[PDB]
Amino acid sequence: IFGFLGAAGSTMGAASNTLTVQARQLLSGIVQQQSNLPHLLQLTVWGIKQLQARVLAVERYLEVQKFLGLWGCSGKIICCTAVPWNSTWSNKSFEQIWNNMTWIEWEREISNYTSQIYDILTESQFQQDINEVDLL
Amino acid sequence: IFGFLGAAGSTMGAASNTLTVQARQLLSGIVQQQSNLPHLLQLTVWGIKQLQARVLAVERYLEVQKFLGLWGCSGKIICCTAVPWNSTWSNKSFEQIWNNMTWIEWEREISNYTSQIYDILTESQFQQDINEVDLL
Amino acid sequence: IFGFLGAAGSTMGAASNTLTVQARQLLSGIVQQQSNLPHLLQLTVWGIKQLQARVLAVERYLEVQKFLGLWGCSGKIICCTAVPWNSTWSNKSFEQIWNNMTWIEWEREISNYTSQIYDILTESQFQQDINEVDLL
Amino acid sequence: AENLWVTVYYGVPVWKDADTTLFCASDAKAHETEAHNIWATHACVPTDPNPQEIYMENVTENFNMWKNNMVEQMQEDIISLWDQSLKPCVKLTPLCVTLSCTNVTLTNVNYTNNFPNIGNITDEVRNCSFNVTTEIRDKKQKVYALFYKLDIVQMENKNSYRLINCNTSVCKQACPKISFDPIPIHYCTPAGYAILKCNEKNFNGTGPCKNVSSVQCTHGIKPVVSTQLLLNGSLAEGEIIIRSENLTNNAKTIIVHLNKSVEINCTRPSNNTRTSVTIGPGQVFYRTGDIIGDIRKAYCEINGTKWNETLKQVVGKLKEHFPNKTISFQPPSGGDLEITMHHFNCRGEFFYCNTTQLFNSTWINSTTIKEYNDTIIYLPCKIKQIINMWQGVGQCMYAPPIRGKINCVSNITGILLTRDGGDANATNDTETFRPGGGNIKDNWRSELYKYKVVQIEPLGIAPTKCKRRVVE
Amino acid sequence: NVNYTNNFPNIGNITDEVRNCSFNVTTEIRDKKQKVYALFYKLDIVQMENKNS
Numbered sequence: 001i002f003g004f005l006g007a008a009g010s011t012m013g014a015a016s017n018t019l020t021v022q023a024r025q026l027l028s029g030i031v032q033q034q035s036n037l038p039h040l041l042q043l044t045v046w047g048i049k050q051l052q053a054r055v056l057a058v059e060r061y062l063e064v065q066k067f068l069g070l071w072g073c074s075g076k077i078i079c080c081t082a083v084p085w086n087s088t089w090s091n092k093s094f095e096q097i098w099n100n101m102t103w104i105e106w107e108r109e110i111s112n113y114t115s116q117i118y119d120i121l122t123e124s125q126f127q128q129d130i131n132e133v134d135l136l
Numbered sequence: 137i138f139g140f141l142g143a144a145g146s147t148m149g150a151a152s153n154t155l156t157v158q159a160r161q162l163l164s165g166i167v168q169q170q171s172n173l174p175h176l177l178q179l180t181v182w183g184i185k186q187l188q189a190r191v192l193a194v195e196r197y198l199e200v201q202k203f204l205g206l207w208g209c210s211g212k213i214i215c216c217t218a219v220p221w222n223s224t225w226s227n228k229s230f231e232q233i234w235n236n237m238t239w240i241e242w243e244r245e246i247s248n249y250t251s252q253i254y255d256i257l258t259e260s261q262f263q264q265d266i267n268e269v270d271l272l
Numbered sequence: 273i274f275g276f277l278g279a280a281g282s283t284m285g286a287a288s289n290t291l292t293v294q295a296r297q298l299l300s301g302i303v304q305q306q307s308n309l310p311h312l313l314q315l316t317v318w319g320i321k322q323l324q325a326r327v328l329a330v331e332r333y334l335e336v337q338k339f340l341g342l343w344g345c346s347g348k349i350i351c352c353t354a355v356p357w358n359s360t361w362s363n364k365s366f367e368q369i370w371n372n373m374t375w376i377e378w379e380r381e382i383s384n385y386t387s388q389i390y391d392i393l394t395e396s397q398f399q400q401d402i403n404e405v406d407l408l
Numbered sequence: 409a410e411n412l413w414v415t416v417y418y419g420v421p422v423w424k425d426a427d428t429t430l431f432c433a434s435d436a437k438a439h440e441t442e443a444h445n446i447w448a449t450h451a452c453v454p455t456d457p458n459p460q461e462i463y464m465e466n467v468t469e470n471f472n473m474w475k476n477n478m479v480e481q482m483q484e485d486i487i488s489l490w491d492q493s494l495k496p497c498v499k500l501t502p503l504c505v506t507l508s509c510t511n512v513t514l515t516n517v518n519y520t521n522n523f524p525n526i527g528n529i530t531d532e533v534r535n536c537s538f539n540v541t542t543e544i545r546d547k548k549q550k551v552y553a554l555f556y557k558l559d560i561v562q563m564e565n566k567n568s569y570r571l572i573n574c575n576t577s578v579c580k581q582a583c584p585k586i587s588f589d590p591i592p593i594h595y596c597t598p599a600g601y602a603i604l605k606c607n608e609k610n611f612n613g614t615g616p617c618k619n620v621s622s623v624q625c626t627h628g629i630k631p632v633v634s635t636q637l638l639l640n641g642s643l644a645e646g647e648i649i650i651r652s653e654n655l656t657n658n659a660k661t662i663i664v665h666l667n668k669s670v671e672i673n674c675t676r677p678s679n680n681t682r683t684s685v686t687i688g689p690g691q692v693f694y695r696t697g698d699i700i701g702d703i704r705k706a707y708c709e710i711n712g713t714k715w716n717e718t719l720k721q722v723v724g725k726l727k728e729h730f731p732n733k734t735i736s737f738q739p740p741s742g743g744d745l746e747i748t749m750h751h752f753n754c755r756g757e758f759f760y761c762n763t764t765q766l767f768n769s770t771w772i773n774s775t776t777i778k779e780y781n782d783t784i785i786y787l788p789c790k791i792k793q794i795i796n797m798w799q800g801v802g803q804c805m806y807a808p809p810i811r812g813k814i815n816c817v818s819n820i821t822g823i824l825l826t827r828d829g830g831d832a833n834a835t836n837d838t839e840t841f842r843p844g845g846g847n848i849k850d851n852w853r854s855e856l857y858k859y860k861v862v863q864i865e866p867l868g869i870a871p872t873k874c875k876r877r878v879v880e
Numbered sequence: 881n882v883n884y885t886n887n888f889p890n891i892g893n894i895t896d897e898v899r900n901c902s903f904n905v906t907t908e909i910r911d912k913k914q915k916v917y918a919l920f921y922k923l924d925i926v927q928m929e930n931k932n933s
C-alpha cells in the first residue's frame with residue numbers, strides 16, 4: 001500500500017488504486033487541538049494564526065465539495081457522467097494516456113479548458129433532472 | 137441568456153431554466169484573493185472584518201446543505217420527494233401556479249408553512265428507508 | 273414523539289425511530305445571531321468567543337460529513353452498506369444487541385475497534401466502485 | 409389532481425432583506441503608492457477587474473432611505489480607520505505651556521500682486537514664544553513659533569496664552585507619512601449576498617424602483633469630509649432632485665443633489681517653512697517656522713454666473729414642493745465653527761471658508777430676468793491647525809503645516825439645507841433655508857441612496873407531478 | 881458638623897476613620913502646581929517615615 005501522495009509520479013492506471021488514502025487526510029490534522037494551555041491567549045500571535053488555519057481548512061474542503069455537489073454524484077470516490085468528449089481538449093487515445101503519462105503532467109495539458117469543462121459538466125446534471133421531472 | 141438573478145422577475149415556468157447560474161456563485165467571490173499587499177496588517181479592522189466575511193460565507197451556504205442532506209436530495213439541483221400536498225397550504229391549481237405566479241412572491245405566500253414543511257419532509261425521508269432497512 | 277437527546281437511556285431497538293430529532297439540531301442553534309445591537313464590538317472579549325464558537329460549530333459538523341461522504345451513505349439518515357461483520361468486534365446475536373443493550377453502552381463496548389472499521393468502510397466503497405468502471 | 413407531490417429546488421432566485429458585514433475592496437490602479445492612505449489602507453482586497461451588472465426587468469422592491477444599515481457600517485469603518493491611523497503618532501502633552509504671545513510684524517513686497525485685495529494674515533495670527541529649561545540656575549530661552557488665533561486662548565495673567573485643546577483632552581500630531589487624500593473605495597459583500605442598485609434617474613428618498621439592476625458589489629465611493637457643501641460627489645444622472653426623510657418635519661435635514669457640477673478652486677497664497685524642534689525621546693514636533701514673500705488671506709473663487717444659475721434651478725425645483733411660498737436664503741445663524749463655517753480638507757490641512765456671499769439671496773416671484781454681468785466671487789477662508797473633527801468621538805489631531813503654496817480644486821455637487829418653522833405668517837409668506845448642519849452621516853448618505861443589502865435564500869419549494877421511485 | 885447625629889445606632893461617629901489630607905499636584909500646564917485638599921479613608925493611606933507626612 002501507499003501513504004500520502006505515495007504515487008504522484010506513478011502512471012495514470014497504477015495511480016487509480018490509491019485514491020482513498022488521500023481523500024481521508026483532507027481535513028484530519030493536528031490543528032484540532034485548541035492549545036497546550038489556555039496573558040490574552042485568545043489574541044496571542046500564536047492564536048490568531050492558528051484560527052486562520054482552521055478557516056482555510058474548511059474553505060478548501062468546501063470548495064471541492066461544492067463542485068462535486070453540483071455534478072450529481074455527491075458521496076462517491078469515482079464517478080462518470082454523460083458528457084461525451086469533443087476530442088479537442090485532448091486528442092490522445094486510451095492506452096497512450098493510462099499507461100505512461102502521469103497525473104501531474106496530465107493536468108497541465110488539460111488545465112487550459114477547465115473553466116469550459118466545469119461549466120459544461122454542471123449543465124448536463126441539470127439537463128438530466130429537467131427531463132426527469134416531466135417524465136413521471 | 138440570463139446573468140445573476142436574471143430571471144428573478146420572470147414567471148414561474150421560464151424561471152427554472154436558469155437555476156444553475158444562480159447556484160455557481162454561493163461560495164466563489166472576491167474573498168479568494170489575499171490582499172493588495174500582505175500598521176497591524178492582521179489586526180486592522182479589515183484584518184478582522186475580512187475574517188468575519190469568510191466565516192459568514194461558509195456558514196450561510198452550508199446551512200442550506202444541511203436541509204438537502206436530510207431530505208435525501210443531496211447532489212441534485214432538482215429533487216423529487218414523496219410528501220403529498222394536502223391542498224391546505226395553498227389550493228391554487230397547477231395551471232394557476234406555474235403560468236404567471238412569479239418566484240419572489242411565491243414562497244412568501246407559503247411563508248407560514250416553512251416551519252412545518254421543513255419538518256414533515258424529514259419524517260418522510262425517515263419513514264422511507266426504515267421500511268427499506270427491513271426489506272433487503 | 274421525543275425531545276432532543278430524549279431517549280439516550282432507552283433501549284437501542286426502541287431508540288432507532290427518533291434519530292431525526294438529534295440530527296435536526298447540529299447547526300440550528302442561537303449562535304447565528306450577530307449581536308444584540310451594533311466602538312468595534314468585534315474585538316470585545318465577549319465578542320471574540322463567537323468566532324471560537326462559530327468555527328467550532330462547522331468544524332464539528334464537517335467531520336460528520338466527511339465520513340458520510342466517502343462511505344456512499346451521504347445524503348441519508350439510516351443507511352447500510354454491504355461490508356461483512358466477522359463478529360470479532362462483537363459476536364453477540366441479533367436479539368441480544370438491538371432490544372436490550374442501550375446506545376451509550378454499545379458505543380463504549382466497541383470503542384477500541386472503531387479505527388479499524390472506519391478504514392474498512394471507505395475501502396469497501398472504493399473497490400466496489402472500481403468494479404463499476406471495470407463493468408461497462 | 410390530488411396526486412401532486414412536493415419538489416424542492418436549488419438556486420431559486422429569491423432574496424430577503426437583512427444586515428451583513430462588508431469588506432473593503434480598493435482599486436489596484438491607485439493603491440501600492442506607499443503613501444498608506446488613512447481611509448483606504450493596505451488591507452483592502454484587490455477589486456475585480458470587470459465589475460458586472462445584471463439587469464432585472466420585472467422587479468419591484470421597496471427601497472428605503474435614512475434606514476440603510478450600510479451607512480452605519482461604513483461610519484464605524486471610518487471612525488476605526490481614523491483612530492488606528494493616529495495611534496502610532498506622537499502626542500503633544502508637553503505643549504501645555506504658558507505661551508508668551510505678541511503680534512506679528514512682517515515686511516515684504518507691499519504690492520504682493522494683490523488681485524483679490526481681500527486682506528492679509530496680520531492681526532490674525534499671534535507670534536508666540538515659551539520658556540525652555542537650561543542648565544544654568546534660573547535662566548530660560550525662547551523657542552519662537554507662529555500659531556493661529558483659533559488655537560490659543562487667554563485665561564488670566566494678561567499677555568499669556570495656552571493651547572485651546574491642551575486642557576480639555578489629549579492631542580496628537582499626525583505623522584506626515586500618512587496622507588489624507590481620499591482614495592476611492594468599493595464596498596463588496598461576502599459571497600451569498602447581493603447588492604441591489606436602483607438605476608432610475610428621478611428617484612427620491614424612498615418608494616418602489618422599477619429599474620433596479622443587481623450587481624455583485626458597489627462602485628467607487630469617496631470618503632471625503634465636508635460640513636456645508638458636498639465635494640467630489642457623483643452627479644445625479646437625471647436632474648436636480650431634492651431629498652429628505654420628511655419635508656414638513658423641519659428637524660430632519662434636506663440634501664440638494666445636482667446634475668451639473670460647479671468647480672471650486674482656491675489656494676493658500678502664504679509661504680511657510682517647516683521648522684523642527686525636539687521634545688521627548690525621539691519625538692520631533694513641527695511648527696509654522698516663518699513667512700516671507702506673499703502674505704494674503706486664503707481666498708476662494710466661485711464663478712458667479714454658474715452659481716446664480718444653479719440657485720435659480722434649485723429654487724425652481726423647490727417651488728413645486730411649496731406652492732405659494734417665496735424662497736429666501738440666509739447665512740448660518742450660529743453654532744460652533746464646524747457649522748457656521750465651510751469645512752474641507754486639502755492635502756493634510758483643513759480650511760474654514762466663510763461662504764456668506766453665496767448663501768445670501770432672495771427669490772420673490774421669478775417674474776423677470778434680473779440680468780447681471782460676469783462676476784468672480786471671493787470667499788475669505790480661514791485656516792485652523794488644532795482640529796477635533798468630531799464632537800466627542802474623534803481624537804484631537806494637530807495638522808502639521810505644509811510647505812509652500814498649496815492649491816486644491818474640487819467639484820461641488822451637494823448642498824445641505826434646513827427649514828424654519830414660522831407660525832403666524834400664514835399670508836406674509838417666505839421660507840428661509842439656512843445651510844450647514846447635519847451629522848457626518850449625511851455627507852455619506854448622498855452616495856448610499858442606490859444600494860440595498862439583501863440575502864439570497866436559494867431554497868424553494870413548489871408542487872409538481874413527480875413522485876420518487878422507491879427502490880427494492 | 882451636626883451633633884444630634886440621630887443617635888439610634890449609638891455605635892460611633894466617623895472621627896479618626898477619615899483623614900483630611902491636603903496634597904499638592906500640578907494643573908493642566910505642567911510648569912505650575914497648586915494645592916488641593918481632599919478627604920481619604922485611613923485604609924488608603926500609609927506612612928513611610930517622618931510622621932505628619
Ligand SMILES: *[C@@H]1O[C@H](CO)[C@@H](O[C@@H]2O[C@H](CO)[C@@H](O[C@@H]3O[C@H](CO[C@H]4O[C@H](CO[C@H]5O[C@H](CO)[C@@H](O)[C@H](O)[C@@H]5O)[C@@H](O)[C@H](O)[C@@H]4O)[C@@H](O)[C@H](O[C@H]4O[C@H](CO)[C@@H](O)[C@H](O)[C@@H]4O)[C@@H]3O)[C@H](O)[C@H]2NC(C)=O)[C@H](O)[C@H]1NC(C)=O
Pocket residue numbers: 505506507508539546547548568
Ligand atoms: C519665563 O521665564 C521668566 C523668567 O524665568 C518668567 O518671568 C518671571 O515670572 C515670575 C513669576 O512667575 C516673576 O516673579 C515675580 O517677581 C516679583 C518681584 O518681587 C520681588 O521684589 C519684591 C520687592 O520689589 C519691589 O520693587 C520691584 C521693583 O523695584 C517690583 O518689581 C516688585 O514687584 C516690588 O514692588 C520682593 O519683596 C519680592 O520678595 C521679590 O523678590 C514678585 O513680587 C512676584 O510675586 C507675585 O507672586 C507671588 C506668588 O508667587 C505673590 O506672593 C506676590 O504677592 C506677587 O503677586 C513674582 O514672584 C519674575 O520676576 C519674572 N522674571 C522677570 C520679570 O525677569 C516668565 O513668567 C516665564 N514665562 C511663563 C511662565 O510663561
Ligand SMILES: *[C@@H]1O[C@H](CO)[C@@H](O[C@@H]2O[C@H](CO)[C@@H](O[C@@H]3O[C@H](CO[C@H]4O[C@H](CO)[C@@H](O)[C@H](O)[C@@H]4O)[C@@H](O)[C@H](O)[C@@H]3O)[C@H](O)[C@H]2NC(C)=O)[C@H](O)[C@H]1NC(C)=O
Pocket residue numbers: 589590632639640752753754755815816817818819
Ligand atoms: C476632488 O477631486 C479633485 C480632482 O480629482 C482633487 O484634486 C486633486 O487632489 C489630489 C489629492 O491631493 C492632488 O494630488 C496631489 O498633487 C500634488 C501635486 O504636486 C505637484 O508638485 C510636485 C512637487 O513640485 C510635483 O512633483 C508634482 O508633479 C505636481 O506638479 C502632489 O504633490 C501630492 O502628493 C498629491 O498627489 C491633485 O493635485 C489635485 N488636483 C489638482 C489639479 O491639483 C481634490 O483634492 C478632490 N477634493 C478633495 C477635497 O480632496
Ligand SMILES: *[C@@H]1O[C@H](CO)[C@@H](O[C@@H]2O[C@H](CO)[C@@H](O)[C@H](O)[C@H]2NC(C)=O)[C@H](O)[C@H]1NC(C)=O
Pocket residue numbers: 143145146147465466
Ligand atoms: C415581464 O412581463 C412581460 C409581460 O408582457 C413579459 O413580456 C412577455 O414575455 C413573454 C415571455 O418572455 C412573451 O411570450 C411575450 O410575448 C412578452 N410580451 C410582451 C408584451 O413583452 C416579459 O418577458 C417579462 N420579463 C421577463 C424578464 O421575462
Ligand SMILES: *[C@@H]1O[C@H](CO)[C@@H](O[C@@H]2O[C@H](CO)[C@@H](O)[C@H](O)[C@H]2NC(C)=O)[C@H](O)[C@H]1NC(C)=O
Pocket residue numbers: 281282283
Ligand atoms: C427504562 O428501561 C426499562 C428496561 O426495560 C424499560 O422498561 C420497559 O418499558 C416498556 C415501555 O413501554 C414496557 O413496555 C416494558 O414492559 C418495560 N419492561 C421491560 C422489561 O421491557 C423502561 O420503559 C425504560 N424507560 C424509558 C423511558 O425508556
Ligand SMILES: *[C@@H]1O[C@H](CO)[C@@H](O[C@@H]2O[C@H](CO)[C@@H](O)[C@H](O)[C@H]2NC(C)=O)[C@H](O)[C@H]1NC(C)=O
Pocket residue numbers: 561562563572575576577
Ligand atoms: C480649557 O480652557 C478653556 C479656555 O481657557 C475653557 O473654556 C472656557 O472655560 C471657562 C471656565 O473656566 C468658561 O467660563 C468659558 O466660557 C470657556 N470658554 C468658552 C469659549 O466657552 C475650557 O472650559 C477649559 N477646559 C478644561 C477641561 O479645562
Ligand SMILES: *[C@@H]1O[C@H](CO)[C@@H](O[C@@H]2O[C@H](CO)[C@@H](O)[C@H](O)[C@H]2NC(C)=O)[C@H](O)[C@H]1NC(C)=O
Pocket residue numbers: 646647648667668721724725
Ligand atoms: C438638471 O436638472 C434640471 C431640472 O431642474 C434641468 O432643467 C431642465 O432643463 C431643460 C433644458 O435645459 C428645460 O427644458 C427644462 O424645462 C428644465 N426643467 C425645468 C423643471 O424647468 C437641467 O437641464 C438638468 N441639467 C442638465 C445638464 O440636463
Ligand SMILES: *[C@@H]1O[C@H](CO)[C@@H](O[C@@H]2O[C@H](CO)[C@@H](O)[C@H](O)[C@H]2NC(C)=O)[C@H](O)[C@H]1NC(C)=O
Pocket residue numbers: 673674709817
Ligand atoms: C485655480 O486658481 C489659481 C489662482 O486663481 C490659478 O492659477 C493662476 O492661473 C492663471 C492663469 O494662467 C495665472 O495667470 C496665474 O499666475 C495663476 N496663479 C499663480 C499664483 O500662479 C489656476 O490656474 C486655477 N486652476 C483651475 C483649474 O481653475
Ligand SMILES: *[C@@H]1O[C@H](CO)[C@@H](O[C@@H]2O[C@H](CO)[C@@H](O)[C@H](O)[C@H]2NC(C)=O)[C@H](O)[C@H]1NC(C)=O
Pocket residue numbers: 512513535536552553554697698699
Ligand atoms: C516672533 O517675534 C520675534 C521677536 O520679534 C522674532 O524674532 C526675530 O527674528 C528675526 C529673524 O531673523 C530677527 O531678524 C529678529 O532680530 C528677531 N527679533 C528680535 C527682537 O531679535 C520672530 O521671528 C517672530 N516669529 C515669527 C515672525 O514667526
Ligand SMILES: *[C@@H]1O[C@H](CO)[C@@H](O[C@@H]2O[C@H](CO)[C@@H](O)[C@H](O)[C@H]2NC(C)=O)[C@H](O)[C@H]1NC(C)=O
Pocket residue numbers: 711712713714782
Ligand atoms: C464663468 O461662466 C462661464 C462658464 O460656464 C464662462 O462664460 C462662458 O464663456 C463661453 C465662451 O468662453 C460662452 O460660450 C458661454 O456662453 C459663457 N457662459 C456664461 C454663463 O458666461 C466664464 O468664462 C466663466 N468664468 C470663469 C472664470 O470660469
Ligand SMILES: *[C@@H]1O[C@H](CO)[C@@H](O[C@@H]2O[C@H](CO)[C@@H](O)[C@H](O)[C@H]2NC(C)=O)[C@H](O)[C@H]1NC(C)=O
Pocket residue numbers: 748762763764
Ligand atoms: C462671514 O462673512 C460675513 C460677511 O462679512 C460676516 O458678517 C459680518 O461679520 C462681522 C464680524 O465677523 C460683523 O461685524 C458684521 O456685522 C457681519 N455682517 C456684515 C454685513 O458685515 C461673518 O461674520 C463671517 N463669519 C464669521 C463666523 O465671522
Ligand SMILES: *[C@@H]1O[C@H](CO)[C@@H](O[C@@H]2O[C@H](CO)[C@@H](O)[C@H](O)[C@H]2NC(C)=O)[C@H](O)[C@H]1NC(C)=O
Pocket residue numbers: 903904915
Ligand atoms: C505644595 O506646596 C507647599 C507650599 O510651598 C509645599 O510646602 C513646603 O514646600 C517647600 C518647597 O520644597 C518645602 O521646603 C517645605 O518644607 C514645605 N512645607 C512643609 C511644612 O514641609 C509642599 O511641599 C508642596 N507639595 C509637595 C508634595 O511638596
Ligand SMILES: *[C@@H]1O[C@H](CO)[C@@H](O)[C@H](O)[C@H]1NC(C)=O
Pocket residue numbers: 086088089113116
Ligand atoms: C469543444 O469544446 C468547445 C468549448 O471549449 C466547444 O465550443 C466545441 O463545440 C467543442 N467541440 C465540439 C466538436 O463540439
Ligand SMILES: *[C@@H]1O[C@H](CO)[C@@H](O)[C@H](O)[C@H]1NC(C)=O
Pocket residue numbers: 095096099100101
Ligand atoms: C509513453 O510515454 C513514454 C514517455 O513518457 C514513452 O517512452 C512511451 O513510448 C509512451 N508510450 C507510447 C505507447 O507511446
Ligand SMILES: *[C@@H]1O[C@H](CO)[C@@H](O)[C@H](O)[C@H]1NC(C)=O
Pocket residue numbers: 222224225249252253
Ligand atoms: C396539511 O398539512 C399541514 C401541515 O402543516 C397541516 O397543518 C394541515 O392540517 C394538513 N391538512 C390536511 C387536510 O391534512
Ligand SMILES: *[C@@H]1O[C@H](CO)[C@@H](O)[C@H](O)[C@H]1NC(C)=O
Pocket residue numbers: 227228
Ligand atoms: C382555494 O383557494 C381560495 C383562495 O385561497 C379559496 O377562496 C377557496 O375556498 C379554495 N378552495 C377550496 C376548495 O379550498
Ligand SMILES: *[C@@H]1O[C@H](CO)[C@@H](O)[C@H](O)[C@H]1NC(C)=O
Pocket residue numbers: 363364365
Ligand atoms: C464471543 O466471544 C467470547 C470470547 O471471544 C465468547 O466467550 C462468547 O461465547 C462468544 N459468543 C458468541 C455468541 O459467539
